[model samples]
Structures are given as structure tokens and as C-alpha cells.
Target chain A: FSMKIGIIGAMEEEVTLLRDKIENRQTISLGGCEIYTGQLNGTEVALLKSGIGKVAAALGATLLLEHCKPDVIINTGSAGGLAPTLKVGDIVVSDEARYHDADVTAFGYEYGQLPGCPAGFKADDKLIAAAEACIAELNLNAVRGLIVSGDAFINGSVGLAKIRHNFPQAIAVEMEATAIAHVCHNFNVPFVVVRAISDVADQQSHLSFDEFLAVAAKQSSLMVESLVQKLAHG
Target chain B: MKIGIIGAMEEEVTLLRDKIENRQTISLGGCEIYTGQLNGTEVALLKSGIGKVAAALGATLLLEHCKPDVIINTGSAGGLAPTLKVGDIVVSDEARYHDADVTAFGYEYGQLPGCPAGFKADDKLIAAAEACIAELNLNAVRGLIVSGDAFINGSVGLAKIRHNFPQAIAVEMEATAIAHVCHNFNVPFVVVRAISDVADQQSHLSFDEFLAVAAKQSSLMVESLVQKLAHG
Candidate 1:
């Protein structure tokens, strides 16, 4: 069976960077549906920008899963380091991630579980291990930890503390990983999160984090490039 | 502060009535709304028969006439979590009414004003109860509890708890109704329950057995809460 990789990002620069790396790219329009197809390292790849936040992430993941039918989805982005042990540019692979903003109580489920996903849903362990192997092969100083996804910016100590408390081993906090994970789990697609830490959880990090995020974004893109190459070879 | 207790069955109401002493029982809105005193705390108690409509009406009357600072719905519920045992106390950290159709009102999704739908139990009330439990040396589990209109039995209850509510400790038939009424009235409310049976496994214990144990445990909780509220 052939495998296709789909990459979802939140901004233009990241999307353009990924788009350029893919080969023999073509845009397909069937009915009113539109999709971009291409190749990365001689394997099929489709890269699209999924905007920001959980809603956009879920929509993008749904569209890609339903239409593109990628074998695995890799979400590459920059995140605020909730774990104090992590430094900027450090990579973190998520074994589990939660949609912190999702309130499952209304659905008569337990708190913390994102409704509409598999029970005790965590990111695919196999995919997480694959990402970790890729990071090791690249010799990147990375940490394997849980990622917490929420709608709010991790811009203050209060928010950081809460995220840390909820996910004790969480290395980073981002906006889209959990939503993507939820959709992928429902569709039985492998999912992986690769994040670069832009800042630590403190005032200094909160004030000038955006600049660091730009740098982290570029590094994350490179990591995705390596991951694509690794997956393609396998 | 005046406390109002709304029960769905005779066992629960009777247990509460026995524990509560001498204020007086008052009839209002063509419903028997029991007013009494417990632990030197004034309380109004009554049984609102099962389902959302009855719960909403009971809560409305209680809030309008009783004017309670807090309304506590105590009852027996089915165990949702596999780890939950019979008589285990499940305190709600948040709650939601699963069958509430927000689309009818042009809303994209139903509102879980306290937390979100798919999760049940109010956090503040859970915390307060947990503190009380700790002080009173009661065995309890603090987690999400769901309130549904229909009685979810056995495997279906397990499936709902696992897929939709992995964090839920217990499932019941009335808490969501109480929550909805409380939300509408802008009154702080909570649902406390004792697991009478495991709903997912279809352990067919008679209704009498379930009610007897649940009433006993629920009465203990109500008495403790009364003291806590009185001192606070």
C-alpha cells in the first residue's frame, strides 16, 4: 500500500515552505471540492494550512482525512514550553494531548475526554515512537512529553501553571494538536505532533515569545522535512 | 441560608424528611414542597418525580418560594466508571444535559453553561463536597458525573461513559434537569450521588435494594453538607 503524508500548519510561511518541498504538485477540483497533491522524497504528500485554534484544526483534519486520505498526519508548529526543564528550540513529541477547551460534560462523558473521539484517546503510540526515532536520528535535543492544546495563548504564568498542573509531563502548549488528534483517532489515521519550544513559562518568555516563535517555526519546519524523508524511506 | 432538597423517589425523600426536624411542610404551586429544619439549618425538601420536565418544575418552585442559597439534588445513580463500586460517592465537578437541543433556538451547539456538554458535575460544588468529605472521613471519588433523562442500563451505559465520558465516575437520570433549572434561575446547584449499581454490566439488583442503600448514603451527605453550610 502507498502512503501519503499530510501536513497542517497555521500560517502562510509554513505552508509555503512545505509546499515548495513537495514535488510534482497539482491541484485537483472535483465538484466544488479542491485539494492540492504533490510528492515529498518520492512519496505522495499533501500540505495545507489549517489556520489556528481547535475549530480550524478539526475542520482541516476532517477535510484532509475525508478527501486526501493520508496515511498519517503530522502537525508541525511552535509551542510555549510548559515544562521548565525545556529550552527554546527543543523538540517535544506528544504521546498524549488533550483539547483543554473541550467540555465533555455536556455529552454525559467524563471531563477531559474530547467528545467524539475514541475512549482514552491518546496520540497513536506507534506514530509518537516514529517521531521520537526521527528526532533521535537527527540528533535533535528533544523531549518526549504530553502536549496540551487550547484556544487561548499561553502568554502568562497563570495559564502556564494551569496547563502544567493538568498535564504534569506536558513539555509544550499549542492550539491545534488535540483537535487534530481527535479527528485522526476517529478516522483511524495515525497522528503525530512535533513542536519546537519557543519560550518557557514565565514573564520574560511571555513578553518576547512571538519573536522566538518565528525562529522555532522555521526549526519545526526543518524537523517536518526530516520526518517526511524518514516516512517516505520506510 | 435555606437549603432545598429535591428527590425523585420516596426512599430519598423519606430519608431526608426523617433526618430533618420541625420547621413545617408547606404546599405551594399544587406541589408538596416540604419545609423543615436539619442540624439547626433551615431546609425545604420535596420529591420531584423523574425526568427533565419534573426536575425543572421542582427546581423552579424551590428557587421561587424556598429561595435557597444552594440547591442539592441527592440520589442514586448507575456506575459509569469501571472503577466505581456500589455506594461510591460521585461528586459532580461539572454537568450537562445531553438531550438539550440548542439548535431549536438557532444556536450552533448546546450550551454547557458550567463546563461543557458531555461532562457533568460542577467544579466548585465538587470541591466543596470533597473538602467536607475529607473532614468527615467519608470515602468518595471526585470526578465528572453525567445526568441524562433516560435510564442508561448496562453495556450502553458503559459505552456512553467510555467513549463520550471517560472522565465520568457515575451516571444518573436527574442531575442535568436540576442543573438546567439551576442555570435558568441563576442559582448555584450541584448533584451528589451514590452508585447503587453498575449500569454497564447489567447487575440486576432489585430497585428496593438500590434505593435503600442510596437513601442511606445520600442522607449522610445531606446531613454533613447541612453542617458545612451552617458553619460557613
Candidate 2:
């Protein structure tokens, strides 16, 4: 338990499995986030069920950092696959996180760029390498690329095209990851995103509901668990 | 002697920036902030990045460092109330997130956990804005102004917000986050915006210059309001 790990999952389905695995878990509610602090796989861990969207995610991340004081933070959840190579249940660990909808170009900033921050919140190298090792050991399909976050639920082709136009390298899209990264950047806390593809952005209409969640959540939970164990050993 | 002003985009804050005397500029977290004297009162103006998190971060930074006596969020919003027309002003009674949904956890829609359902504006500031609007002979209304992370152009999305917050008269991306931060820090604040477009298509039909239409009026309103506060 030398290095405490913080994990943020945005929905009930996303947090339930990982939360169930914690040993001697103690729950403390703050800022609408359900935070459970305990040990997982013999490593100290703090898990947060932050509500959806950017504001909620930022607030929850701040609380997680300020209250739990974990050495590193990891955002785990399910996202719609934006890259053509992704499929349901595949993993996409963030190389960086950016906002698909943030535009301040009128002021000489890049599209999807925030002021006083990089165009993308770069993932910690040690954490990224650890995640990759765990993914290989678990025999999971995974790639490291940009994960874009916005307030909009991108389901239509029009929406998908707009995102692709703004962020051509995006591998996944969700509501909370970029914001968590933003807060971590400001707080100077090391963080990484670990997402499982729940559905493809272009195929949302034909996808069966809840089918992907079952598989995706399990994959993400396994990855987070393995990553925690790996990072703890070092 | 110091007043803080925040706007999400450059178009919304440009006029006020132009009016600053002896303006000094600084970049915080890449946000372009202007500080100077306006009508004999010290002022700090920020072009806060778009969206809820950006607005909250900008507000937090503004409050933490500048420590102004008050904060005024000026911008342009899509009109929700039917009576509102382009260039009409909206003074905030309060602001709430139209997009935050935590109902599965038993929290109310639009309510942030551990935060009030609506962040109320300071009464004196609201009155000052109203006085300025009236003095300038501009049409204005005061009601709930909803904030979210989306641009909100489609009817389905518009209907969802209208259904959730029926009393809401305006929609934008940054106001509530600014108000939320101000509330947490015990800072008195108010939002003053002009209608750039309306949810219903009638206004959109003639929306050739959306930003230009509202920017002038809102900026004028805030500029006038500042004069009143500076003397008091």
C-alpha cells in the first residue's frame, strides 16, 4: 500500500463491479460522488462514482484528489468507439485526452484546446506503460490513442463526422474523461484513462441495448484491477 | 475598487476590453485576461474558455487571484422564453445546469450533488443590471438561465431542457458554472446576457449575424452597469 490509487467511474454500471471487489471498503459521500476507500488486490485504493458530464466529473475528480489524496488517478468507464479499428469489449487506454467540443480558436488556440492547458492532457508515461503491460498479460485487445470528451452524446453520423473533423485521431468518445484529465492537470495529479468500447459511434442505431455494457464493464474492470496490482508492485 | 468580469468567448468580451484604460493583459492557464480601470473602478476581464468546466476553472482562477469585489458573467444565449427576441437582455435570478442528470441516484435533475439546485444571483447586482438596462432603453427579462456543455440547436434537446426547466428563459454554456463557483467562494455575482438566437425557428430564420447582434447590447449593458457601481 505504498502508492494509493484513485479510480473514477461515471455510472453505476461502470463502478459496481470494481467497487464490489474492494476489501474493508469504507464509503464517504461528498459533492454527489460516492467515494469508497479501501484495499484492492493488496493495494490501497479509492473509488469514485462521479456522475456524468464535464462539470460533475471535474468536481468529483477534485474531491477525489483533495480528500483521498491518492498518488495517481485512473478514470475507468465505457465509451463509444470512434476509431474504425475498435470493436465492442476492446480497450483504449488514453495516450491523452482532449475535448471534442471545446473551441477557442478565435483567440489563437487550437480547436479542442483549453486555455493554459495543452491541446491534450498527456497521460503519465509510467501509468500508460503499466496499463499496456496489464492489457497484454490479460490477453485483451487494446490501443493507446486520444479519447475525446464532450457534453453531447455523439450517436449520429453528423455528430461523428463533426468530431472526426475536429479531432481526427480520436479513438473513443465519452462525457467525462477529458474533464477528469483537466482537473488532474490543474491539480498536478498524475492520471490516465482506461476505457472499454461499449459501442461504435457510427453503429449506435443497430446496437442492442445493455448487451455491450455487460461485456465492456467486465473488460474495463479487469484492466483496472490488473493495472492497480501492477502499479502497486512497483 | 476591483470588479471581475468573465465571458466564454472573445466576441462577447471584446467591447469591454476595448474600453479598459491603461489595460494590462496576462495569460493564466492560456486564458487571456485584461485588467485596467473602467469608469474609475479597477477591473479584471477574462475570456473564459467554453463549457462548464472551463467556466468554473476560469471563475476559480479569477476569484483566487484578482479577488474582485464582484463578478459579472456577460455573454450571448439562445432565448427559451417565447417573449424574448434577438438583442433582448436576460438578467439572472439564478442559473442551473440543464444537462446534469443524477436521477438514478435520487438527486433532482439539474442539481449538482452538494450544491444548490440553483445558484442565486446577488440581489443588489441584479438590481444594478436592471437599472442599467432600463436606463439604456433596452428590453430585458429576469428568470432562470440554464447552462450546459452543448450548443443545443436541435428541438429534441431543446424540448428536454424546456421540460426539465420550464421556467428557464435562456440557455448557454458557461453562466451556471461561474455562478456555482461564486456561490462556493461566497462571492456576490450576476449573469447578464443578450439573446443571440431563439430556440424556436422564427428567430433563427433571420439569424444572419448572431454574435454581432447580442454582443453590442450586452456589452453596452454591462459597461453602463459598471459605471453605476463604480460611483456607488
Candidate 3:
């Protein structure tokens, strides 16, 4: 079976491995977004650097879907771990995605819920299963749970504590996942997020997120590669 | 000529919707788009729900479905510049996000990769809005308008915005996102808003207190600008 995959990362470090691994890679810029198209592990892929935040992610996702026409999209990057069990370099496969900052609760909506969309965008069942199977095969420290996104970086206990209070089930928090999920939902495409923890989302650590990003990104990129291989072979 | 306008709240757009002659309304999801003649020009006014995604969604829908020649965002914003007061107007010279931070990757504060540091407003729209401001004798200033998803109410949030964008005169939830969409679509766009608060600890209080007055001011400018574009 042949498959086409769209991969999105918010930063260059997050997408560098895939970019380097792809064969016959051709790159283009659409409205400032960098899109690279080629074959990775014999599966056709279109990778994008989606930038940061909801609007930027949404725009990049929109452009990728419209231009690349990929059957599935996988958002790969590093995130701040919200769950106590998560540690640096641990992988998170999102079962669901939601916003951490959006609030219309005064109008009787749930926290993080958008006005006209579902409270959470559920990942494709097959995609989640494939990712789980790949994680097991690779013996990765991985968990599947809710992943929330917001524009603000959760750097301190004050920020981390608030997110934990608001979303107790969240495994990780990042700037772009939920927005990419939202766009995929609207586009009627199957999608999932695979993120590696760069930090605990509290005050700075022994190695800051900046210093630790390459390690975290490598983990997520490996998981994405493994998952893509599994799906392509299946 | 057909023009598109967007506001983040119903109250912010109510007066303009009411002024539309022979109006036709369409609801995409929960957002409303009203199309009709306003101040002698065909216009579509969108009541984009609050927040960045909502605004982006609204903008995409409006640009795709309505296909307006140019878009103008008219609404209320929290005043950030010291000279700005409640009911004062702001014409955006440029727009950017206050909350988007990717400086860890060497991107400018508030800049998203693949996008400009600030989305510049159309000069003609700004000049026309200033003409309207002059005719109405409204207290108005033109400068950067910063947007984010959260309502800024405390010193921490204010300080963050000031530190990132000291020239920002207005703060809101949707303008920069709208500007972003317009930038993507290559559509000429401008933002005109009136201040409802100072974005301080007392912001929400004054926001509620002066929302009606600010909305009225913004509506007035939008109306005049439409006429200016139509017959200038």
C-alpha cells in the first residue's frame, strides 16, 4: 500500500532530521512557510515548518492541506510536559487535542472549548494504534493522552500550575498542536501529534528547553519515522 | 465596491449591522456575516467571535465566501499607550501578536516564522480613517496594535506587552490574527478601533463601563470610511 504523509514542525530543529532523511527533496515557500516534498522511508511526504502559535499553525496547516494534498498529517515537535510522570525526552502521542488559552466558559462552554467546534479533536483511531505499536516496537517512553496548546510558553510554576488545574488530563502543552489538529479537523483529514518532552513546563531546569530541544526533537522525529514506516508497510 | 469588515463581538458590530440597508445575513458556524449597502457602498460585516482562532476562522470564511475587495476591522480594544483613554480611537499602522513568543529560535518577539514581524496596514485605508476621525473630531492616534487570545488585566500581562512592543497603542484579542489572514490572502486591510479601557487592573471594569461608547465611536468611523472609499 502506498501512502502520502504531511509532517509539520514549528521550528527547524524539529524538522531537520526528516528533511535530511527524505529522498529527492524539493522545497518551496508558500506565503513564507517552508514546504519540503519528497519520499521518506519509501513513503511520499510533505513537511512544513508551521511557525508558532494558533494562527500561524492554522495558516501553515491550511496551506499544507491545500497545496500538498496529503492523506494524513503528523505534527512532530518538542513540548513542555504537564503530566508529573513525563520527563525529558519522553514521547507523547496525542489521543486528543484542545486549546489551553481559549475561554468562552462564561457563555457556558467548557474551558479550552471553541465556540463552534468540538471540545477536543480526537486523533484517528488507526493513526493512534500505529503510533502506539511503533512506540512499543522501539521501546520508547511514550504515553497517549490529551495535549493542549496555547500561545504562551508555560515556563514557571504559576503557568504550569494553572494549566494543570485547568486541564488535569493533559500530558503535554505546546504552542501549535491543537491549532494544527483544528485545521485538520476542518479539512477532514486524519491527524495525530507526536511530541517529545523538552522540559517539565515549570521553572528552568539543569538544561533549559533551548539546550535540550535537539535531544527531545530527535526522539519525536524517530517516533514519527517509525510510525510512518509502520503505516506505509501496513 | 464591496468591502468586508470584522468585529470580535456582537456589541462591537451591532450599530453597523443596524445601519446596513437591505441587509442579508449568513451564519457560518456561530459567526454572523451581514452583507448589504452601508454608507453607499456594498459591504459585508462579520461578527467574528473572540480569540485568535475564531478570528482566523472568521477571516478565512469571509475571504473565501464573501470575496470582499478589502477588509477593515472595526471594534474595541484596550488602550495601551499612556495618552490613550476610554473612547479614544486607534487606526492601526501595523498589527502584531503580543502573546506569540518564539524568541528561543531567534525569531523576533511576537513574530511567527514565515510571517512579518508586524503586518502593516494599508496606507489608503489609514488615511481615509484619519479623514473620518478628523470630520468627527474624535480623539484618535495611529500606531501598532497588538493582539493576543487572553484579556490583559494585570500588571504582568501589561508589562510583557510593553517590553515586547513598546509602541503598541492598542491591545485586543483578534486584530493581529485578522491582519495575518489578510496578509495571507494578499488583501488590503486596516484596523480601526476605539478604546474601552487602559488594559490595567481596572481594565475589565472600565471595559464594561465604556464598551457602548467605544463601539459607537468605532461604528461611526467605519461608516464614514466606507463613504470615503465609495466617493473619494
lDDT of 3 by residue, B1-232 (tens): 8999999888999999999999999876356899999967999999987788778867877887799999999889989888888889999999998877666556788887678999999999999999888888888999999998767775777888888888899998899999998998899999999998888888878887999999998898898999999899
Give lDDT for model 2. Answer: 0.83
Q: Model 3 in CAPRI terms: which quality?
A: acceptable
lDDT order of candidates, best first?
3, 2, 1
C-alpha lDDT of residue A16 in model 3: 95
Please state the error at residue B135 of candidate 3 in Å: 1.3
**lDDT per residue (tens digit) for residues A1-234 in model 1:** 288888877656546666777789887542212346888768788776765555446545656665688888888878878766677888888877775433334336544453234433476677777777778888888887678776556555565676666567667777778767766765667888887888775666655465686777777888888888777775
TM-score of chain A of each: 0.87, 0.96, 0.97
Q: What is the DockQ of each candidate?
A: 0.02, 0.17, 0.36
- Which one wins by lDDT: 2 or 3? 3
Off by over 4 Å in 2: A106-108, A203-209, B1-50, B58-89, B93-139, B143-172, B179-190, B193-232
Would you list the clashing residue pairs of candidate 3?
A: none
lDDT of 2 by residue, A1-234 (tens): 478999999888899999999999999875456899999978999999987778768767766776788899999989988787788999999999998876545346787886657888998999999999998899888879999987656565677788888888889988899998988887688899998988776645225325687788889999999999999885
On a 0 to 100 scale, what is the lDDT of residue A173 in model 3? Answer: 91
Best-to-worst DockQ order:
3, 2, 1
lDDT of 2 at A137: 91
lDDT accuracy of residue A189 in candidate 2: 82
Tell me model 1's lDDT, rounded to 2 decimals. Answer: 0.66
Show where candidate 3 strays beyond 4 Å: A1-4, A20-28, A38-44, A103-111, A114-120, A202-207, B10-47, B60-69, B80-88, B103-109, B112-117, B154-167, B183-187, B196-216
